[PDB]
Amino acid sequence: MVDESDKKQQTIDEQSQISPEKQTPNKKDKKKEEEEQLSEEDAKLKTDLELLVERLKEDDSSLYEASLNALKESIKNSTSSMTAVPKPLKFLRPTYPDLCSIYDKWTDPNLKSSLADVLSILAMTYSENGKHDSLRYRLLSDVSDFEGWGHEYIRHLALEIGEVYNDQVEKDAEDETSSDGSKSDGSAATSGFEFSKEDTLRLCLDIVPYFLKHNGEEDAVDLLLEIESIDKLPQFVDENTFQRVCQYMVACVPLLPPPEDVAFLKTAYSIYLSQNELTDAIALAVRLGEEDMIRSVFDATSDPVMHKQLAYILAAQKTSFEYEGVQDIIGNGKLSEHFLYLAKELNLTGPKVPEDIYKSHLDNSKSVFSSAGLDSAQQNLASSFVNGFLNLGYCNDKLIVDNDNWVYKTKGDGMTSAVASIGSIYQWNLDGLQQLDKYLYVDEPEVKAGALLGIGISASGVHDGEVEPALLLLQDYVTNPDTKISSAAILGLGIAFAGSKNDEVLGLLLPIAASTDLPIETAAMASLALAHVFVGTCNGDITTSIMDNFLERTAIELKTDWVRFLALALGILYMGQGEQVDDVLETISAIEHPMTSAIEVLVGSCAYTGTGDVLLIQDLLHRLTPKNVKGEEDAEIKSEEKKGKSSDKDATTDGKNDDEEEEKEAGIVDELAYAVLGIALIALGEDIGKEMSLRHFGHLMHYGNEHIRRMVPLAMGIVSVSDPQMKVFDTLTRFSHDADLEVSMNSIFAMGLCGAGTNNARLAQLLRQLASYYSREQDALFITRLAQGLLHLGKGTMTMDVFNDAHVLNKVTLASILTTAVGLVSPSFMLKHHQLFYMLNAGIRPKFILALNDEGEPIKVNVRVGQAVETVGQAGRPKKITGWITQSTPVLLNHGERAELETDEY
Amino acid sequence: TRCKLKLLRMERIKDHLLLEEEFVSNSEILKPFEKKQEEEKKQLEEIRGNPLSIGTLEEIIDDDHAIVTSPTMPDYYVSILSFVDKELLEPGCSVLLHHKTMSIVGVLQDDADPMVSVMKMDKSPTESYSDIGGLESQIQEIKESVELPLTHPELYEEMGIKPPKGVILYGAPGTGKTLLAKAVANQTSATFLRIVGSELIQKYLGDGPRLCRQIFKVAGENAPSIVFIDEIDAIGTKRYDSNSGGEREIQRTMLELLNQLDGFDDRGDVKVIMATNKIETLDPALIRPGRIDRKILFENPDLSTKKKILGIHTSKMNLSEDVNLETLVTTKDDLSGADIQAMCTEAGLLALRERRMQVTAEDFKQAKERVMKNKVEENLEGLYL
């Protein structure tokens, strides 16, 4: 047993029934007793190594318990052996697996904690010689296939995960963290990580991102980078490895802080570029927003095939989908230089082809002149506006519009909103300009402002077609000093060219009207106009706007509403990255007022984005403080107080949303789950929280783009028939709108009937009826979703009109703005190279609610449809390519992506 | 695996955050005691001496008096005094009466019985959808009746057809019928009531019919809903004999449920899941389609089905990749999906006797012999002649 006659090799055999225990006195007693016997043990070292292989052939707990009795004690300095510096060093190799065995395979908690330290040294010291590499290698590669190796190799690597976790847990890190007591980086441990990773990309799918995330650094993905680039084609095929990369990156990335959060994306982007598939890579180019990166991918797509074929078409369409349009302009010039065709490519990169495909679709869904709304009083105003909302997207309603009767029959400021909503009939399309131009010349100042706003809404279907520019119309009215006319017009410019950067947009907006010279609320719209431009790409965090916010705010603070307009605008401008938004957070914070702190919270919500670690906690310390001030009391000046309280409530939801969009899809269900319990908590807490929180809650549902769309929206709506505020119906219903005639079929009957019934103020009526009608779309006419394109959690550019105006008190002046709802959703068509409209077949899975899709890998069951279909939010989204009948391969590989299909048909 | 880890991280920061928020939020210092609350409070203590002996409001006479029966055989012609509106009270409501003098001090009851709480079992379905190894084709018949009007009312509304009323699940046990039941339940997130039909078989006088009425009331209140009358046949076609006092009860219960299943018209908003082994060789008591609509017979598992079920199980096992999966399923005749489940469980048990922690390459070919032989004995099919 432990006997000093069981050292012999004679007793290998007699013992081995029970468990080999020849090893036990051979490395114990011989090491202690004589140091001539360490050299003797070296000759016996060959036998002792083979015994380990025999004890891993049969994997059972009995033969690990029984073998070790003192192999556990003896390692090197136990036996005070160090003699000939070489011998005890080679004797580390057999005793190393020994410990790993009794730690786990026979279950024992105490040994897990205690020997976690011992074991990690032994691996670090001997990997420097690179002879621990060799001990690991023989079980990693399984030349001899058995059960043993499969749990042994897991152990070796379990310990490495321990070593890098020491960096995360304490600043002491390295050796000084004695959970291991072995550094994260040296000249012996590093050479171990790499070697393990190469072998284990093949053997396991999930030990590799384990090491990545617990390290909590980009040091982990640098070693991986080089490894993946070796392993990409030979070990396993380009497509299969490409799958491994997309898994790995999404698991590690939400955790990490803002400077490194971005670093994991740059590493992933670069991998994707290198591998043949650039379909994923174009996505990553949107997220960073660097102009440099979009140029690189785009050219990489075009350069392989020197003719139009699939290649140029693919490049163009990927950029088109993002209706930011920033990408489109970058892509044109490469395409235009080659000159296979100038025009078709420009059109197809541009948004002109997106206008055309919809025209085909309308015919099917059926062109309607349908109107809803009632006569007399404040509904006389409504009915007009409502025709607009119901005729979402491009639709024929030409003859209704042609009557000047209905338009002049509107009263007041309502006249303004009427002409803008005629633009909403003709949304996403030039055609129907002519009706609007008429208003622009004739009668009231009111309808001139209306005409300009509406021309904005309509011309959105361009920004890089450069066919009827917005700029041509819109310049002249800036010059007319009348405040109403100019305001409609310079906001209009912002919407029509949208996110796209063009010389024309910058030079129009270089003069701003935002000053103390017009105290008027409507001057604020210059800075708001700027906000469209910047979004969807890396912000300059332009200083022009900061200067004018401050000036006007300090000077007039009597009007809260003026300064709230300015504040949220700077906020919107900031969406798209957080890093440079941190820097300017300081500028604002230098000057301090109760007013400043409304700004602090809002811009902070963008700024701290890039982690949930700080962001989530912070906007909850802020939520807590109001409750505390009041509870204490229980046991110009007005303008300051009001702003503070309302902004704090607003910022709380907004922060949650920023978090969910950026981070994984598990976080969406999760934030929502906080959110619902949260209502009870804020209702208890205060009267003021009860009212306000409702209004933002419908906006949480929509901006968050929630998976679940069944029980929660219906719970909330029923509950707020009774409760004050009917602006909650507006915000909520735009979520309910994204899956048309589903959530909204309910909406229309319940809210639209009861609202009419229980009527006791026409103003309330207006709010209820407008939401309930909007939410429905006649026989699935075009839907407005947050999705920008391939992003479905994309930073909104023309749908942040909801963010601006949910916050501020409802108004007759609001009704004009609210007609904007631009961001229509493309059908899904199989295309090759001849652009033959509609899909052959594609899979959609309309049963999604699952919070365990987070990879971005479609639920591949589907139910197959042959009709072209719009992409329905979280109810239609998963997308598989089905076109195997004529034998095809995806050239555009769907990931649940909004994108139209592209295949190579044989 | 990994997908599950990603979620753990979020769930543990949601709980933490909430718990901390909660102190303040609930109160702990907020202590509303301002004029509106204080009113309620002062009054409530004064008026209400306790205990309070509940009644049932039988009728109203307009003169702020009511006639109630108390639990005492003498009933009491009472005043309505204070609190609850006269209008709000409709006959058949259960009511709080004050013990010194019986007066209507309010309602907070709404005919609360413990029976409703017992039945009420909305609680976390153990199944998500398609964790099950069952076939897409069987589940997408239940889903068609039950899910599809709630998710897409557009198509049903447009066609103009009524939403279906009920399904019947019958198989073949070991087709995972109740698994199917809780797959459906998860997706809908409907109030999922459950009652077992043997609780409606008792010698106790008239209790069966009372229970039957409760069920329709419960579902309607908590609508949209799925009502699992599990072993519906316990009441119905299935027996408890009539030389045991059953010449009274069983007749009355069967009729009663039958009469309410047709009703004055089908509700068409209460889904039912009716379980029964099969009503092929049993008498039918589930009274014609249109009140039970589509009836679902689950296939006995064929060779391709059990492949999918088998794939779940082989994942945990190590040394079953060298074992050819395809040949284990084929060699066995077509049999229950339960028998593949049995095999996996036996397989591990058997490895342990060999002394190997997880299955050996050999262990799996061996496993099949023990399970097939046991199951064929248990259930013998007609021998070809």
Binding site: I161 | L5, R9
Partner: peptide, 11 residues
């Protein structure tokens, strides 16, 4: 493997 077992136990 083992450090991620204890994440379930906490949850």
């Amino acid at each position: 493997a083992a450090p991620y077992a204890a994440k379930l136990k906490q949850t």
